[PDB]
């Protein structure tokens, strides 16, 4: 499965002047574009080598819409400030995520379009791609305007059309790096905390995509409550890292076995402390 | 390619 997403962040800055608009684009776990209105002459920039194949007309097309969003979000921020009876002295944030998910056939599997205000859900497009879910009555004012403007219809046309078509174009242009699955390099480590209890750590390294399952077991029984899992982190070279830890009493080290599940692995690997 | 329409909230 493959996906394309755009992440928008619009922040009001009363001290600094005019609101700032940032847009980043992703194909799965790979970032390929960025825009920041905070420049004298802002422009869309490539962030993945397979997108540099696109000519100048593509970069102008992206810049024109992101300049429109800069203007649009300045008003959305002003309007939302009114709905919540907020002071103009305060800094606020509108965030938005939208995109398409494809299946194994190059067809729209699921469409998305969600908005947030000050870090909380605001308005989201439903799975039917024709109706909205508003978080409160302020979001219902936005919903009224968006229904009158037929925003769900505009989104359905895009998610079913241009979103899947361009995601397919990107998948083909970056085929060797986007349609490749990097399996994790696994190893188990031992770290004593006391004389009679030691932490067993299971490592997953250099994997792509970020989607991974790490589970600790006691003779084939899940240790869900006792297992300490760290949030999947980027290595900085487009690969990911993750580890799972368990406080194991001295002597019962060979008893514990860890299980790794990833797209790049044909069979889920079972690992134990060696030697 | 991004969505090419925006509507004030």
């Amino acid at each position: 499965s493959h996906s394309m997403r755009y992440f928008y962040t619009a922040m009001s800055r009363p001290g600094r002047g005019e609101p700032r608009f940032i847009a980043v684009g992703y194909v799965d776990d790979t970032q390929f574009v960025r825009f920041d209105s905070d420049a004298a002459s802002p422009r869309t920039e490539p962030r993945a080598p397979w997108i540099e194949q696109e000519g100048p007309e593509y970069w102008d097309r992206n810049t024109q819409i992101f300049k429109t969003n800069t203007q649009t979000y300045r008003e959305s921020l002003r309007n939302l400030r009114g709905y919540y009876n907020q002071s103009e002295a305060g800094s606020h944030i509108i965030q938005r995520m939208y995109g398409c998910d494809l299946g194994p056939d190059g067809r729209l599997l699921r469409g998305h379009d969600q908005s947030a205000y000050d870090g909380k859900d605001y308005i989201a497009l439903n799975e039917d791609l024709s109706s909205w879910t508003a978080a409160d009555t302020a979001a219902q004012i936005t919903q009224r305007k968006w229904e009158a403007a037929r925003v769900a219809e505009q989104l359905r046309a895009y998610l079913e059309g241009l979103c899947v078509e361009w995601l397919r174009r990107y998948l083909e242009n970056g085929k060797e790096t986007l349609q490749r699955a990097d399996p994790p390099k696994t190893h188990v480590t031992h770290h004593p905390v006391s004389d009679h209890e030691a932490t067993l750590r299971c490592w997953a390294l250099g994997f792509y995509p970020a989607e991974i399952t790490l589970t600790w077991q006691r003779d084939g029984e899940d240790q869900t409550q006792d297992t300490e899992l760290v949030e999947t982190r980027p290595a900085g070279d487009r690969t990911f890292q993750k580890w799972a830890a368990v406080v194991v009493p001295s002597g019962e080290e060979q008893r514990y076995t860890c299980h790794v599940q990833h797209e790049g692995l044909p069979k889920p690997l079972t690992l134990r402390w060696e030697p | 390619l991004p969505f090419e329409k925006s509507t004030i909230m």
Epitope: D60, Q71, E75, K145, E153, A157, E160 | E4, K5, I8
Partner: T-cell receptor, first 116, second 114 residues
Framework: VVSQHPSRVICKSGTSVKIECRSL??????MFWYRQFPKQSLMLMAT?????????EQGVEKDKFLINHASLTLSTLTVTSAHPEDSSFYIC?????????????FGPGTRLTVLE | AGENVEQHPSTLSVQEGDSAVIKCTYS??????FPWYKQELGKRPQLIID?????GEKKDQRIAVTLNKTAKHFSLHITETQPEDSAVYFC????????????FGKGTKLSVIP
Amino acid sequence: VVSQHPSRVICKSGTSVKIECRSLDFQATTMFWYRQFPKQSLMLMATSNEGSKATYEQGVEKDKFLINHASLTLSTLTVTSAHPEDSSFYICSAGPTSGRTDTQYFGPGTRLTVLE
Amino acid sequence: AGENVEQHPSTLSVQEGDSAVIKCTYSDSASNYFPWYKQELGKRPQLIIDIRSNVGEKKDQRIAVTLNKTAKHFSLHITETQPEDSAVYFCAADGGAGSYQLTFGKGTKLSVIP
């Protein structure tokens, strides 16, 4: 809905006519100004942009038609030093969606008659 | 700027009760919004129907719109024509590069002889 004022104008040559275009129930970052001659077609003259300068179409005198995007609800068309050849039906349109143009709602039009 | 909308025919005469079809062609694939406007003499164009790139056909009473996105053309279908349908009809598309706008067709003067 979108409205216009005046709906009909009769003026002597040399006078300037200011035509308003208002979005009555939504905010518009863009408004479009058209000219309709006895030749039925909608000829786009200019695109009013908030708060940047207007985008004129090919074969449109910038100095004859002054477009100003006054606010998120009002755009004005000024026919400077009008002459009988400037007599036409001036109609505007606006819509709530910005970016790649979507549903447009037209004003009632302004009939301008310039007499010597 | 990179969008050209062609409306065929320029004029059309039909008998009250027969069907009328206006055909529009477009050039750009960024065109996803296809509105149809009806303009009576001395009056404003009114939106009567529209279609989007994800839909092949949309119907509303006697009015219908058809879209063929592969061949890049769309049609208005008026059935059981009434003399009140007599007006100038315009079609549009939202595609093309440069300045954002609806690219209109030149029009179709429809005449419904009672």
